[PDB]
Structures are given as C-alpha cells and as structure tokens.
Structure 1
Amino acid sequence: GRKVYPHHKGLPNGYWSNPTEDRSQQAIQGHYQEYRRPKKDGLEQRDDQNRSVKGWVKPLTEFTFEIDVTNLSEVELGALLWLLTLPDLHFHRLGGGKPLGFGSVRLDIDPDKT
C-alpha cells in the first residue's frame, strides 16, 4: 500500500534537547536518540552516508497557512476537513527525517479566517 511514517509517540523530555551531544549509546527512559549519528571512537561520523543540519525548526513553533479549494464535493471536502480536524494526539508527518522522528505536526483549522 502507501508507505507512512507513524508518529514517534512518547519521546521523553529532553530527547530533542542539546542535540550536538551524542546520547545514542545510552538509554534515557528506554529511548536511544535515534535521530543522531553515533560517535565513532569519539569523533563525528560525517561521511557520505548521512547529512548534517545546521539547525532545525523548534518543537511548538507555529505556522499559519491557507488552503484555497474550488468545487469540492461534500465527500471531498469532508475528507480534507477530517484530516484538518483529527482528534487530539493525531499528528501529520512533514518534511525530512520522518523515520528519525522529525516533522510530526498538529494541524487544526482556524475557523474565524475560514
């Protein structure tokens, strides 16, 4: 079917904090810092198998955008608004590094602007 990257539920507090620290060789609440390359012999494994990011967009930062739609049926609109009004703790998966846990996002309609 369609490949999807399920939301990384239950990541511990501080899992994403201070990411330049190699914590991957140590359990914290049972998680192992999957998003970071491990050290090898104490030096960073920057090679052609992975990439580096100079930064990322922090958790809890907010974006607004608009969707303009034309001639949607109620079924087509219902599917869209269903995706835009999912129950709590349902998250979309956006951008790169999704299998590392990056890019889980909360989408909800702003009704006053709709």
Structure 2
Amino acid sequence: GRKVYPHHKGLPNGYWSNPTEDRSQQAIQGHYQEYRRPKKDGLEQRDDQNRSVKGWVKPLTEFTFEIDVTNLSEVELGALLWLLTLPDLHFHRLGGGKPLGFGSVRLDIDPDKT
C-alpha cells in the first residue's frame, strides 16, 4: 500500500543542533546523528550518492497557508478537517529528507480566518 515515513519520535535535545558536527559516530542520548553523512578518514563524504544542503528551515518556524475548497461533501470535508485537527503529537511529513527525520510538521486550523 501507500508508503509513509513515520514521524521520528523521541529525537533528543540538540539532535538537529550544530549539524556540521559529525556526531554520527556517538550515541548522544541513544541516537546517532542519522541525518548526516558520516566522515570518512576525517574528511567529508560529499560523494555523488548524497546531496548537501546550504541550510534548512528551522524547527518551530511557522507558515500560514489557506485552502479554498469547492463543493466538498461532509465526508470529503470531514476527512480534510480531520487531517487539519489531529490530536497532539500527530505530525505530518513534508518536503524532502523524510527518511532522515526532516519535514515533520504540525498542521492546525486558524478558525478566525476560516
């Protein structure tokens, strides 16, 4: 069926912090720096199997967007609004790098603009 990338629950404090540091080889709070290509012989493994990113959108940053909907039934609308009103600690997965933990996002409705 439909392939999904489960949210990386329980990533410790500072997991994404200072990401240039090759912490991939130590179990800091029980997790390896799984999103970063490990260094080999002390040099960066910028091979043509991996990409590199000059930056990323920080965690806890916030985006607002709008959905304009037409002729949704109550089931079709209720399915949509369920996704946009999931209980706490349900997170959507967005963009790239999802296998590595990137792109976990919380969606919630702004009711005053709906």
Where on the TM-score scale, by shorter chain, does this alignment land: which range? Answer: over 0.9
1:88-113 superposed Cα distances (whole Å, 9 cap, x missing partner): 00000000000000000000000000
TM-score normalized by the length of structure 1: 1.00
Secondary structure at the aligned position of 2:24 is classed as: coil
Q: Give the gaps of 5 or more residues in structure 1.
A: none
C-alpha displacement at 1:29, in angstroms? 1.0
> Counterpart in 2 of 1:3?
3
Q: What CA deviation, in whole Å up to 9, does each residue of 1:52-100 have, x standing for no partner?
A: 0000000000000000000000000000000000000000000000000
Percent identity, aligned pairs only, is: 100
| Runs of 4+ residues over 2 Å off in structure 1 | none
Greater RCO structure (CA 8 Å; 6+ sep): 1
5+ long unaligned stretches in structure 2: none
Structure 2 residue aligned with 1:63: 63
User: Offset of 1:11 from its aligned partner?
Assistant: 0.2
User: 1-side partners of 2:4 and 2:48: how far apart?
Assistant: 25
Q: Secondary structure at the match of 1:40?
A: coil
Please give the residue correspondences for 1:44-55 in structure 2 after superposition, counting only pairs within 5 Å: 44-55=44-55
